[PDB]
Design a protein around this ligand. Sequence first.
Ligand SMILES: CN1CCN(c2ccc(Nc3ncc4nc(Nc5ccccc5)n(C5CCCC5)c4n3)cc2)CC1
Length: 304
Amino acid sequence: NQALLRILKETEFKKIKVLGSGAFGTVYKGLWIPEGEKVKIPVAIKELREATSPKANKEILDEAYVMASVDNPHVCRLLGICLTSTVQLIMQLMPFGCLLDYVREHKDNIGSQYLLNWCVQIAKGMNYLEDRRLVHRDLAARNVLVKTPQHVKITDFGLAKLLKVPIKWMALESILHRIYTHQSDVWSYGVTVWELMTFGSKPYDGIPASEISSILEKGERLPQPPICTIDVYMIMRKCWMIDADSRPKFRELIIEFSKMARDPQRYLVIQGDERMHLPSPTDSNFYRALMDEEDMDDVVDADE
Ligand SMILES: CN1CCN(c2ccc(Nc3ncc4nc(Nc5ccccc5)n(C5CCCC5)c4n3)cc2)CC1
């Protein structure tokens, strides 16, 4: 459906401030000014680095329709595009930013219920992509956004194909053979889970990217995060098995983390955890009305 992708003119929006960047481009907070109206509506804008040829223009556009068709509570939808000298991609602006920064800025003031729910929600978004027969290729905590603390959304879907290789996130077959599959996405999911559980540690810190295939081939893996019980760590290790088909499926990952979320303290050990709990319904309802009206599945709660 082509109607899911608004074609914007450079006159209808402005970039206002830089929010971050990646291998792809620079992300700005922007203002959309509609249609002979006064108002300025905040948006997020990724401007791609290399200038766009017209012929590739069709190629980018074809991919953009797919990106705009992504409809799930846990994956960010591409809203609009502007094609010029540059390709500009328009999406919802999220006051809370990316998950990687969030867990860093809240290090150790985050409860087992939040961490285990995020893991569930990430697995639900990835599962949806798999169901659409789509592969992300660049899952990482930096590409998951926080809509509210209770609701996270994978972003950056589809550009990796569309146009700095994240070797430390990559399944070994992707490093060696540039093969990308749902099962390599599962590998990067394991790394993403590891970033959350360490409150945003850098994976294989201090180790050159060039050495990573060798240490993987030797059966070395990211170390067990100190808050993680063994069952949590074994799931991560399973995500990083050499045989791609031995790795869990995202549908299994949804089930396992959901079950752990029902008994959060049995699976993560966090000091002060009883002092930390999911928002009361009162606080959840207020958040939804102010900044998260979109339909979504219930967060998994503790049985007791
Ligand atoms: C000192 N910190 C102050 C606050 N800060 C910040 C950054 C971003 C947001 N929000 C926000 N929203 C939507 C985004 N959509 C993409 N990415 C994106 C990807 C593809 C197409 C369009 C946007 N981003 C990226 C991820 C984080 C940096 C910007 C987005 N970021 C809120 C606060 C970071 C610096």
